[PDB]
């Protein structure tokens, strides 16, 4: 199959505005939310119907208990960071863990933390160590690296457990995750040529402009791949026209193993 990934995020906020959760944790498979938990609901809940239908209540119950504990651990860690930074006010702590199963069958695994949205600690599961970006992180690095068994635990989780979960959820969601909807592509003038694609799935696509058969990445304005709201995606790319010479322009679109060329007359 195509490359797929499983990721879980955590967000902690030290002094949130009223009503706003101090803690949130959300799982994804590829771009699809699969699970959610926060300090207001205090419950782990499905965010995709193909998760609700395939995971029995004991799964949600058990991970609800674990996330209640992870919530508390997150608060304690942020409290410790903000004291050692000597920071007043509201600050954020974030975590991201996950894995990828690549098309060729190889795998990746990653775990990292951020303070106020900036990299803080990054796990290397091959050297079994933590990369610290500053001296507050360096202190945490020393404490975490002192617990060698926990580093080995995380390497096993990233390399074996996480890949196993990914494969299980990919099978649950296969009718969503493994489908292909081809793009509908058109060119218009706005002088710049716009190449516009919509209705496609998966969201990974490459659009570019060729002039006389040569790509010119520096002259191309690449639009973001954006959700259309119905499960499909849209994207665009534009190039400006040279009114001093005649040139053959063409939009090239690559999606899910299919290449398309639209030559502008």
């Amino acid at each position: 199959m195509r490359t797929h990934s499983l990721r879980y995020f955590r967000l902690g906020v030290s002094d949130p505005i009223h009503g706003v959760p101090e803690f949130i944790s959300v799982g994804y498979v590829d771009s699809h939310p699969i699970t959610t938990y926060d300090s207001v609901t205090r419950q782990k809940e499905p965010r995709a119907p193909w998760m609700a239908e395939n995971l029995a209540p004991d799964h949600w119950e058990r991970y609800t208990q674990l996330l209640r504990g992870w919530q508390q651990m997150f608060k304690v860690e942020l409290k410790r960071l903000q004291r050692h930074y000597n920071h007043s006010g509201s600050h954020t702590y974030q975590r991201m863990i996950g894995c990828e199963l690549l098309e060729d069958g190889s795998t990746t695994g990653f775990l990292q933390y951020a303070y106020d949205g900036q990299d803080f600690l990054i796990f290397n599961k091959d050297t079994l160590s933590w990369l610290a970006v500053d001296n507050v992180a360096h202190t945490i690095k020393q404490a975490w690296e002192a617990n060698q068994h926990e580093l080995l635990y995380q390497k096993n989780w990233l390399e074996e457990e996480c890949i196993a979960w990914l494969k299980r959820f990919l099978e649950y969601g296969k009718d969503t995750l493994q489908r292909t909807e081809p793009p509908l592509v058109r060119v218009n003038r706005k002088t710049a040529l716009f190449c516009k694609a919509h209705g496609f799935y998966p969201p990974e696509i490459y659009m570019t402009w060729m002039k006389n058969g040569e790509e010119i990445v520096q002259e191309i304005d690449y639009g973001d791949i954006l959700p259309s709201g119905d499960g499909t995606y849209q994207a665009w790319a534009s190039i400006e026209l040279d009114p001093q010479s005649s040139n053959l322009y063409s939009c090239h679109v690559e999606h899910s193993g299919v290449h398309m060329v639209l030559q502008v007359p």
Partner: antibody
Amino acid sequence: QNIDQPTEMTATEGAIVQINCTYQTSGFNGLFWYQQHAGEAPTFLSYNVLDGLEEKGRFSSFLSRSKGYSYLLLKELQMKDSASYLCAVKDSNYQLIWGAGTKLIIKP
Amino acid sequence: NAGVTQTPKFQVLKTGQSMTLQCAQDMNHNSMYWYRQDPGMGLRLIYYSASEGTTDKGEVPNGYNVSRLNKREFSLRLESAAPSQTSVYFCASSVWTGEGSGELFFGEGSRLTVLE
């Protein structure tokens, strides 16, 4: 989800004994050994989660994830090693599944 | 310091009688557990408490209830003792749960015999 270890083993003082544990679990987040002297509380001995052998004093603990197998190795046995030894595995949901214990008897 | 302190060490009960087992830990641990140990089988979890402020059933919750009174204390209640509840009860704690490598710290055990 099953853990298996022998009920009882008997070895001689000064010798070496290998206590086996095999497991079939729904996922794997590590294998523990505990010591429990008769009438007393279990105490932690070891944790393994990657493959291989780890030494702590006179005790070593081995793990093979592909064989679903661990042993606890006691060298230079002493009378004080007479105890039960409990194997336990954390599954995919971090539930600990406990073996029924191996009672180790030491002949002076 | 003291580690895990549970009481009582021994208790005789008549069928139908009520009993509370006490457990406290002074190690600033977050997770606490109540197990029973019976001959011929591995430890079985009765109830656990992953963090202060939450508890949930283990594998053998029927006939029991718990209270995570605060971060230190986790009590186990037998509202109406039954002979099948004759067992050795162990309270345990760990720093967190849902992490792989952290071990359990056990109390001394409470031996209960329930008689008709």
